[PDB]
From Swiss-Prot, chain A:
Transmembrane segments: none annotated. Expressed in testis. Expressed in the lung, brain, oviduct and nasal cavity. Disruption phenotype: Mice are viable and show no malformations. However, homozygous males exhibit complete male sterility due to severe defects in sperm mobility. Sperm from mutant mice exhibits teratozoospermia characterized by short, thick, and coiled flagella and sperm axonemal defects. Females are fertile and give litters of normal size. Mice display early onset hydrocephalus and severe mucus accumulation in the nasal cavity. The chain holds residues 1589 to 1627 of 1682 of the full protein. It is found in: Cell projection, Cilium, Flagellum; Cytoplasm, Cytoskeleton, Flagellum axoneme; Cytoplasm, Cytoskeleton, Cilium axoneme. Flagellar protein involved in sperm flagellum axoneme organization and function. Involved in the regulation of the beating frequency of motile cilia on the epithelial cells of the respiratory tract. It comes from Mus musculus (Mouse). Belongs to the CFAP43 family. This is Cilia- and flagella-associated protein 43.
From Swiss-Prot, chain D:
Flagellar protein involved in sperm flagellum axoneme organization and function. Transmembrane segments: none annotated. This is Cilia- and flagella-associated protein 44. The gene is Cfap44. It comes from the Eukaryota. Disruption phenotype: Mice are viable and show no malformations. However, homozygous males exhibit complete male sterility due to severe defects in sperm mobility. Sperm from mutant mice is characterized by normal flagellum length, but most of them showed abnormal forms and irregular caliber of the midpiece. Females are fertile and give litters of normal size. The chain holds residues 1741 to 1784 of 1843 of the full protein. It is found in: Cell projection, Cilium, Flagellum; Cytoplasm, Cytoskeleton, Flagellum axoneme. Belongs to the CFAP44 family.
């Protein structure tokens, strides 16, 4: 199990990081929208 | 959109924009003066003076919120000539600022 | 090829220069006035294609001196355009601005922030022509440039916000006019500091909106702030001039130069701002004539530093007559001294 | 316990497909910026 324990903890940290990644992409998409929407 | 730019720009920017947009022009002038004073002090002083021990003001939104509420009130009073309203609001700031970092 | 001044046909030669191209007589005359009264021939040294610079050092020298001449004339053209906008000669501004833009395109390229000043002058001329959507074109370009821009300075962005506000001021939302001029005022304040004439120009446009809103006390407050700025700067020069002239005398002696230190376009904008401020300050509230006396002092000082002697005298005499009833002796004695300086100089 | 790893992977892929959608939005906005560039052309 310890192999899957290691990869499960890897996914725990990777999914939290992905939550920061999707926050990053959400600000990226919203600001790129903002460029076209302001003008 | 513009609201997103307003929150996404610095809270310092956000309150400057609110202030001058809504005619709190002198409230901006005061905020600028104090903010520059804070920055100057925290840069300039001797390397472990309390000014260098001060927190960053810009990081610290609750103090900018206190400036927003009290300066908006005090300028609304300042316009009137009802000088005691100005006194009371500025003293409310002053006593909020009755702490070691805010002494000046 | 085209009429470079408007991209209509090259209907006629520029007989003054051959290098300039005109869509016949109307643009021929307007561009003759606009660029050729200012410099005319100097564009020919720009327009001539170089013969071969034969070595690396020759190429470098020839490029450097050509480019720096181009830059110098680019800025002179942009100053001329600014003055034509302030003088209301928007017809003459259109050639000067379009030339300055095209030369910025050539040296800097269309992508440059350096075009943004010219683009905004082309908006300003368009609004002088009422061509609101045309101004919106060049503001659109500028806005994309600055939003991308890696380095836009506080002054540059203040220019952007100021012209954005002016465009909405031709539009119909006073809220946007305040919002954008406020941004201009902020960026001016942090670039220049809070007492610069350019910041005061922001405050002036804000005051004019508050006057249109008939919010008399805020409008007058803004007019006061601007008037105080203009007063303080002109005082700084006038005092320094008299103090230096007083300070010391070797047997060599000296005489100091009476000087505004302003751009002539900044002097024209000073006159426009102070005159509108005076008239609006009176019409909003004749109850404070002393503020009119202050503006009269300010303009009389400006006129003296120009040696606009006629208005310097007239406005000093007005200020003195008003100050004798309204004000303490310090005002009257200052205005008398200024009149004595004008009449002696 | 493997089921938890599978479901965490599946929701990870859900966030991948969300961001790929945003990549298509970015491609759209790139085409919009090119459209506005064509407006730059500044004929008169
Ligand atoms: Zn010519
Ligand atoms: Zn034409």
């Amino acid at each position: 199990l310890k192999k899957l324990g290691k990869y499960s903890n890897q996914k725990d940290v990777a999914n939290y990081t992905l939550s920061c990644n999707l926050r990053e992409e959400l600000v990226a998409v919203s600001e790129r929208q903002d460029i076209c929407n302001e003008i | 959109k513009e609201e997103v730019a307003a929150h996404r720009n610095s809270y310092k920017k956000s309150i400057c924009v609110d202030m001058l947009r809504d005619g709190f022009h002198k409230s901006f002038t005061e905020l600028f003066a104090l903010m520059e004073q804070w920055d100057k002090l925290r840069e300039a002083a001797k390397a472990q003076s309390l000014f260098w021990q001060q927190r960053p003001l810009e990081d610290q939104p609750d103090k900018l919120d206190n400036f927003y509420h009290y300066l908006t009130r005090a300028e609304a009073a300042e316009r009137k000539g009802y000088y005691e309203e100005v006194y009371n609001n500025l003293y409310a700031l002053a006593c909020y600022f009755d702490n070691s970092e805010d002494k000046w | 090829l085209s009429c470079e001044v408007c991209e209509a046909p090259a209907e006629r030669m520029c007989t003054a220069c051959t290098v300039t191209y005109y869509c016949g007589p109307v643009h021929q005359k307007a561009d003759w006035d606009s660029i050729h009264a200012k410099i005319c021939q100097l564009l020919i040294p720009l327009r001539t294609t170089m013969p071969f610079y034969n070595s690396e050092e020759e190429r470098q020298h020839g490029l450097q001196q050509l480019q720096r001449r181009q830059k110098h004339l680019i800025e002179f053209c942009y100053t001329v355009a600014q003055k034509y906008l302030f003088e209301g000669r928007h017809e003459d501004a259109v050639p000067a601005a379009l030339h300055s833009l095209r030369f910025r395109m050539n040296v800097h390229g269309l992508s440059s922030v350096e075009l943004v000043p010219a683009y905004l002058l082309l908006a300003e001329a368009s609004l002088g022509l009422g061509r609101i959507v045309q101004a919106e074109e060049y503001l659109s370009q500028a806005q994309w440039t600055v939003l991308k821009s890696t380095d836009c300075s506080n002054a540059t962005h203040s220019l952007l916000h100021r012209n954005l506000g002016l465009l909405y001021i031709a539009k119909k939302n006073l809220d946007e006019a305040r919002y954008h001029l406020a941004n201009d005022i902020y960026f001016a304040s942090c670039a220049y500091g809070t007492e610069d004439i350019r910041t005061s120009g922001g405050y002036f446009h804000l005051a004019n909106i508050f006057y249109g809103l008939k919010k008399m006390e805020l409008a007058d407050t803004l007019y006061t702030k601007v008037s105080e700025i203009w007063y303080t700067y002109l005082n700084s020069h006038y005092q320094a001039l008299l103090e230096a002239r007083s300070q010391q005398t070797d047997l060599l002696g000296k005489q100091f130069v009476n000087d505004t230190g302003l751009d002539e376009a900044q002097e024209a904008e000073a006159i426009r701002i102070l005159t509108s401020t005076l008239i609006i300050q009176e019409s909003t509230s004749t109850k404070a004539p002393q503020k009119s006396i202050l503006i009269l002092k300010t303009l009389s000082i400006l006129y003296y530093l120009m040696l606009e002697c006629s208005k310097a005298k007239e406005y000093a005499m007005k200020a003195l007559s008003l100050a004798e009833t309204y004000v303490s002796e310090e005002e009257q004695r200052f205005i008398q001294e200024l009149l004595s300086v004008i009449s002696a100089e | 316990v493997r089921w938890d790893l599978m479901m965490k992977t599946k929701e990870h892929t859900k966030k991948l497909h969300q961001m790929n959608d945003l990549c298509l939005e970015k491609k759209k906005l790139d085409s919009r910026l090119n459209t506005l560039q064509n407006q730059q052309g500044n004929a008169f």
